């Protein structure tokens, strides 16, 4: 349980959400650009701090 | 401690022919044994309760019988329905124990392989990984040979995968996945899929010149 | 009608610890018996615990004991199995079966199943790759189209076609490992009116990692 932040993700195929536990929220994008990537998402990343929740949309 | 054995292990039968699987207890269970079958990836089904009732939605074709130490249950016609695995239970005294399970494979008419090859996604290259598959699908005999030539030269970085019968149209699938690097893939060009199955002397065989557009 | 679901499932380290849940309904939950039965993947199922109607009686087999704690709230009808030392083999899929009343001495009802694997792994989500045909007649009248879910572990992943409304002829293929990562394929064969006309969307879930992504499969468009 060490810190619990989400990815949204609505790219041109790719519509969905993972998930990844981290220690900084600039932990979480490092992780998440990387699995974005992986996946071929490619676009504009905002993030909310209430919610934990980063999101990727093109 | 009870101990269920079940035998044969594995059988193969033509639709429409009799089958008979065996459960023995290691003492009695009077007739406190079920059986429960579990077609491919479901959770198991109750099937035969006490050790010859028949439970929601068997019909008569299927019979189970025992008494204290030998139990059988009965296909009378086997069928395509029927494809799965038979877990018998005793229930008499804890712990509660069963037996390994029986496959029922369909024996069938042989039926010659459907072979796509698909081309790895502008994605998966993105992130500097070509990865090439090939379906063949629906034969019978599960018996079959992929052969990955690159340009028409041969390798080892496959990775391949089988299905349970279909359970409607008895029936096998494969899935042969030549994983290879950006700059590999890359500094190669034609991508065969061959495959020879006993329905065919001549090889099925999968193409794909890169046309990239 | 009777209805029964795991939960709780997931990665966990050897020596671990995890609490797995089963929502009973559709049925009086107390007035029956219930049961933890796993399955390995290799065998058959292995019976894991017992509770009688109201917790009074409780049995273990021997495997679990002093480790496994099996309870029950009635009164919001779901039971559990809180598990304590995971081990490498306590890795399987869990179901809860009901009883049953005479003459019913079987598992009665199953639930779903909750995987739980221990292990030191990392939990990794999987990678979706469209398989996409998109230029080349390949028909009889039917296109196939697949999806390919490479790179994670623990297992598993579902893939539905369409949220399910693509039962059709739908092949997904067991997971190899390569390097502590599954990789799996999935397909399905339409007919020549829809590849692109309709969209044909592959579902895919990674419980462990809770990921439930749609990859829409376009024509490769050249």
């Known amino acids: 349980a060490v810190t619990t932040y989400k990815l949204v993700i609505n790219g041109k195929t790719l519509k969905g959400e993972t998930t990844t536990k981290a220690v900084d929220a600039e932990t979480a994008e490092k992780a998440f650009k990387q699995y974005a990537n992986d996946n071929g998402v490619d676009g504009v990343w905002t993030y909310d701090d209430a919610t934990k929740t980063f999101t990727v949309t093109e | 401690n009870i101990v269920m054995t079940q035998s044969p292990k594995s059988m193969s039968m033509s639709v429409g022919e009799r089958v008979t699987l065996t459960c023995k207890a290691s003492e009695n269970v009077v007739t406190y044994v079920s059986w429960y079958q579990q077609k491919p990836e479901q959770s198991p089904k109750l099937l035969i309760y006490?050790?010859?009732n028949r439970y929601t939605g068997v019909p008569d074709r299927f019979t189970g019988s025992g008494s204290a130490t030998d139990f059988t249950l009965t296909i009378s016609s086997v069928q395509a329905e029927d494809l799965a695995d038979y877990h018998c239970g005793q229930g008499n005294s804890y712990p509660y124990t069963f037996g390994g399970g029986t496959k029922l494979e369909i024996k069938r008419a042989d039926a010659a392989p459907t072979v796509s090859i698909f081309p790895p996604s502008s994605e998966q290259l993105t992130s500097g990984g070509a990865s090439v598959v090939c379906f063949l699908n629906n034969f019978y005999p599960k018996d079959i040979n992929v052969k990955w030539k690159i340009d028409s030269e041969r390798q080892n970085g496959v990775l391949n995968s089988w299905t349970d019968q279909d359970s409607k149209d008895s029936t096998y699938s494969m899935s042969s996945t030549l994983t290879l690097t950006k700059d590999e893939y890359e500094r190669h060009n034609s991508y065969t899929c061959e495959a020879t199955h006993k329905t065919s002397t001549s090889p099925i065989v999968k193409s794909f010149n890169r046309n990239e557009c | 009608d009777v209805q029964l679901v795991e939960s709780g499932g997931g990665l966990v380290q050897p020596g671990g610890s995890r609490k797995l849940s089963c929502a009973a309904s559709?049925?009086?939950?107390?007035?029956?018996?219930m049961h933890w039965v796993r399955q390995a993947p290799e065998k058959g199922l292995e019976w894991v615990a017992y509770i009688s109607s109201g917790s009074s009686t409780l049995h273990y087999a021997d495997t679990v004991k002093g480790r496994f704690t099996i309870s029950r709230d009635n009164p919001k009808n779901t039971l559990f199995l809180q598990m304590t030392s995971l081990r490498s083999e306590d890795t399987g899929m869990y179901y809860c079966?009901?009883?049953?009343?005479?003459?019913?001495?079987?598992?009665?009802?199953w639930g779903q199943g909750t995987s739980v694997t221990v292990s030191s792994a990392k939990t990794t989500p999987p990678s979706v790759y469209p398989l996409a045909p998109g230029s080349a007649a390949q028909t009889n009248s039917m296109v196939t189209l697949g999806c390919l879910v490479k790179g994670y572990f623990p297992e598993p992943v579902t893939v539905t076609w369409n949220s399910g409304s693509l039962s059709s002829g739908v092949h997904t293929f067991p997971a190899v490992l390569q390097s502590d990562l599954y990789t799996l394929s999935s397909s399905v064969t339409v007919p020549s009116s829809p590849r692109p006309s309709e969209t044909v969307t592959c579902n895919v879930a990674h419980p462990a990692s809770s990921t439930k992504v749609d990859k829409k499969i376009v024509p490769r468009d050249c």
């Open positions: 559709g049925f009086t939950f107390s007035s029956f018996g």
């Open positions: 006490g050790a010859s």
């Open positions: 079966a009901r009883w049953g009343n005479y003459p019913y001495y079987a598992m009665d009802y």
